[PDB]
Design a protein around this ligand. Structure first.
Ligand code: PLP
Ligand code: PLP
Ligand code: LYS
Ligand code: LYS
Lengths: 446, 446
């Protein structure tokens, strides 16, 4: 009828509709997957994930200029996709680096991030030979120096910058004094003080400048300002140390935050266009200050891992709730909740939800997809439409849950993690099995 | 000097200072606790907890009238404490029931909650002989009644109401149409419809009405109006069924949300006083409509498990961030983060945090206790104060993390769940061990 259309910018590349009207991913009907693997279920469309890997890499000239941000979603299978498609991998803590290593990720294609890197983390990284570390404090620079000098290597590093730009969807805020934990201020001199300290020692070596300015960005405008303010530092450093000790700072890392479509109306720019533009503004901005254009590096998380995966639920309860003297809201309770998708409660995110186990001829009715936790705020999709005949047993899917949902998953109310499955050219396979009661108790020490 | 005083209403009841000025819990210096067990670390003052159980029990007449809300924090060890203290236990999903059972908590004393109970969950609960189930939809009534009949029993049952009172700290909102997922509206007739269904079944027995109206409540005003609306439903229920079928509805459960002190300035009423007003609100309101007073039940989660415990961290980085042309904010980055305490990001919570490894002279400086994840919003304490000589390797501790902290814990950025440890009179045992790279990978297949 009208809730039937599956906006292609929102749903995985390989979504189709059955002859019996069952939504399918990679040739497999979602009903099949719920019978085989249970619900709730995370369903990853592997070709989608790889596709986006490939489209981004082409857009920026090389998969090497594209670092996947592990925090969006990480496991061995994914580390292995990243590796195969030739991108780099951005890990953020000791734990992330471990997993990437356990999955035999090339450690020269790993960059390590973080505002509070411990000593053991910095050690373990040069020990495996990570080969970029984006430093975030004077203290980390001191530690990294000792540690690296001790190992008899020269660690390539980037310094993380605050340029006071914060971008989201179609706007951005600029501030005199960015008030957050990451990076070093350009304007207050802290960043230049750091650039010096890194020049003072022989055990580190500054190879670029990093800036991360937001998420869910749909415009290039904020990157342009951010890039201007970053290249501005570059100017300052060749102005104090002359183009020679500086020739080797040839990378500008503009971070991630490249947005995706959670809702049909969401209109992030095709990656190719976006990339062409950024490349232009990096080249205009560096030339208009007397400097050879540096290479552009970005760090996508979501824009790779997000659209390809969907979360499949089973309707359990359907309750009509009166919200005014005339109007109602259809609360449809589902298999999971803030345990596998906290994004709605935590960031006020908005998702798209659809009936997938069949096609309904019933009219659209206003609705709330909620979960099963004992908390009124356990809402998965705050505002949507649902066919009037939605009923227990039906299966629904929430789109674009591949980034940030599982990584943030918890065991609230002792609800185990859902299973994760990948589907590819007709074939599904369990990647991350579903937690069980034994898992829930595994930490308990008798 | 003033960052030195540990308010007694905020920190666990057995908190003290060393002769060398180190903070201790039930007699163990925190710094000692840190070297054996590591940080991040949950330290539970076991005796504060039991102490909290006994007091509440005493106020509302008996442990039978106080059900502890598992969702706040649950493991076998805690299940055992609640049991030993003679209270009941509210569980919310299958997993919560399972753990309680494994800890062989007495099922007569368990009560099952939830907005979307599954057929299997309700089946398991009748099998275990659960004893009370608070029903939330007409669908649950059909499902439950069948399940009880097949098992040959009559399941006692309360109905969850929506009375249009939402309460927080020193105020409450009233609404004509409460717009949330739980319960059955009284004003709409949804509640009567439910009461009527339960009376009409063969296999259910209605023994009370249930109402939960908020969180962090400090006034009794919201409870008053609630009980009023709630007991007004009882008044209808004898205007239909007359008194003889209604003298089985003998329990009014007013939910939880009883408040606690996160900051020194927080003034929740002392439990013995609260109970006594609520007891009299129920008797005044109960005869006001010609009924004999039902017994009052209450459902604290936070008020039991909250204050007893704290979270111990190790400062790793200290950055001084310019937030104004003249002002500064001391970013003190720490050992875990939103993974072990998401409340600040999720609800905008406000916590106390103090230096505990030692005493300082240095004057207090404005600060933000921040975590180690690759996200700017990874903030544990947004607005506090730290001694100016604060430096890495120091130990700080955050008060009142006993409730909804570890329950909400995730593995964001593969940061494993901290260890949880109980301390009773100079002795400290491990309760929940800390996760490791193996637990991180424990759901991987191949
Ligand atoms: C989170 C993060 C990213 C990725 O963010 P997305 O919005 O998911 O694209 C990239 N770089 C850094 C430093 C980050 O913290
Ligand atoms: C959360 C909850 C409680 C207790 O809440 P606290 O604020 O932690 O006291 C009681 N009953 C129900 C049904 C709940 O969901
Ligand atoms: N908001 C509380 C739980 C309230 C439950 C509302 N039905 C928490 O901190 O988790
Ligand atoms: N506020 C962001 C979350 C950022 C995730 C990591 N920096 C969003 O739109 O979801």
């Amino acid at each position: 009828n009208e809730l039937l259309h599956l906006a292609p910018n929102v749903w995985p590349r390989n979504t189709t509709r059955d002859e019996v009207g069952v939504v399918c991913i990679a040739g497999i009907p979602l009903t099949q997957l719920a019978q085989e693997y249970g619900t709730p279920l995370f369903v990853i469309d592997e070709d989608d994930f790889r596709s986006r890997c490939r489209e981004t890499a082409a857009a920026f000239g090389s998969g090497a200029n594209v670092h996947y941000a592990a925090k969006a979603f990480l496991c061995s299978e994914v580390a292995r996709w990243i590796s195969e498609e030739g991108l780099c991998l951005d890990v953020c803590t000791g734990g992330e680096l471990a997993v990437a290593l356990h999955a035999s990720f090339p450690p020269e294609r790993i960059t390590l991030h973080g505002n509070n890197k411990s000593v053991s983390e910095l050690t373990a990284a040069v020990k495996a030979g990570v080969g970029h570390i984006v430093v975030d404090s004077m203290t980390e620079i001191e530690r990294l120096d000792a540690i690296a000098g001790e190992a008899g290597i020269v660690q390539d590093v980037l310094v993380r910058l605050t340029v006071g730009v914060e971008a989201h969807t179609h706007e951005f805020i600029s501030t005199a004094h960015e008030d957050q934990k990451f990076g070093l201020s350009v304007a207050s001199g802290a960043a230049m003080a750091a650039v010096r300290r890194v020049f003072a020692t022989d055990h580190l070596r500054l190879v670029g400048l990093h800036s991360h300015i937001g998420s869910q960005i749909f415009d290039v405008d904020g990157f342009e300002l951010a890039a201007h303010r970053v290249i501005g530092l570059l100017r300052d450093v060749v102005g104090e140390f002359g183009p020679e000790k500086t020739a080797q700072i040839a990378t500008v890392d503009l971070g991630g935050g490249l947005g995706i479509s959670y809702l049909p109306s969401d209109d992030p720019p095709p990656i190719a266009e976006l990339a062409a533009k950024l490349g232009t503004i990096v080249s205009d901005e560096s030339t208009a200050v007397g400097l050879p254009t540096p290479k552009l590096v970005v760090e996508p998380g979501r824009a790779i891992a997000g659209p390809g995966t969907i979360t499949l639920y089973e309707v359990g309860t359907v309750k009509d709730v009166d919200v005014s003297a005339t109007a109602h809201r259809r609360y449809v309770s589902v298999d999971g909740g803030m345990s596998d998708n906290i994004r709605t409660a935590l960031y006020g995110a908005q998702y798209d939800v659809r009936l997938v186990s069949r096609v309904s001829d019933a009219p659209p009715v206003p609705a709330r997809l909620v979960g099963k936790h004992c908390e009124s705020g356990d809402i998965i999709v705050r505002d949507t439409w649902v066919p009037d005949d939605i009923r227990p047993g039906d299966l629904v899917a929430v789109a674009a849950t591949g980034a940030y949902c599982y990584s943030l998953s918890s065991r609230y109310n002792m609800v185990g993690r859902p299973a994760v499955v990948a589907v590819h050219a007709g074939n599904a396979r369990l990647v991350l099995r579903r937690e069980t009661v034994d898992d829930l108790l595994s930490l308990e020490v008798r």
